[model samples]
Target: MGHHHHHHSHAAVRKIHVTVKFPSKQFTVEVDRTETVSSLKDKIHIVENTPIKRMQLYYSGIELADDYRNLNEYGITEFSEIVVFLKSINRAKD
Candidate 1:
């Protein structure tokens, strides 16, 4: 008997072409709906040599703050455009 396997659908891996708009330049990247926002950032970092720690992604004027959240959960679909902003990094010391 099949058990413990429920509420899961076997759907095709739908790849979406996301456009990353950076301050210096813009580029397109392919990602799946199942990929997390963090993964997308990782790709950007690997491709553009950008610092992942300082990178901030925004979509539809909303910040993608949570790294663990999937891109699909954020309503990021095909042909979606994500804006990148490099936040200032400074260490605080007493």
Candidate 2:
């Protein structure tokens, strides 16, 4: 038999509405702290129809190079504004 129990859990996932600014315009996307840089790029692609491969994201003058790294790794906080740039030249090696 089952008895009544209190339903309590950490159901509210912490998130923030970040702003992505492109050369043409800017938009907001809600993302979790644990989300990776690439995830945000994908979201931008979905919303703005921008190409992911050529997109470069920057925060505080540092490039978000590693896609697998979490967003918090770059010190991105609530309401942080990320600058986006589309590369015109071919991909170059580091």
Candidate 3:
């Protein structure tokens, strides 16, 4: 019974610190696993002054590209290390 209680507390800690590596430095942002990807990007904008479209987050070279899904759905959790790379917006002229 005590073991189950311990696990429950771990689950209760759903909010995690996502470490984002910028080119110049690293920063940690506290976020809930249940939150949408769009929401997290918004925080990055405030922190880095970069827009969501210009940013691409990669974990082990895999792009976390589901903006509609919760962060946890992509296996992102507490203290998960991810890199933020800036992408240039290329325009295709007609």
| Top candidate when judged by lDDT against the true structure | 1
Task: List TM-scores for all candidates, in order.
Answer: 0.78, 0.77, 0.74
TM-score of 1: 0.78
lDDT of 3: 0.73
Clashing pairs in 1: none
Candidate 2: what lDDT?
0.78
Give the lowest summed-lDDT range of ten residues in model 1.
1-10
Arrange candidates, best lDDT first. 1, 2, 3
Report the C-alpha lDDT of model 3 over 1-94, residue by residue, as the tens digit. 0121212324566588999987666899997777667777867877886778778888776787777776877888788887987775483211
Residues 1-94 of candidate 2 have per-residue lDDT tens digits of 1232434333577788898998788889898777777777877878875677778998979999787788878888888889988774575321
Q: Which pairs in model 3 have colliding backbones?
A: none
Query: Whole-model Cα lDDT per candidate?
Result: 0.79, 0.78, 0.73
lDDT of 1 by residue, 1-94 (tens): 1232333233567678999988778999987787777778878887786767678999998899898788878898988989988785474211
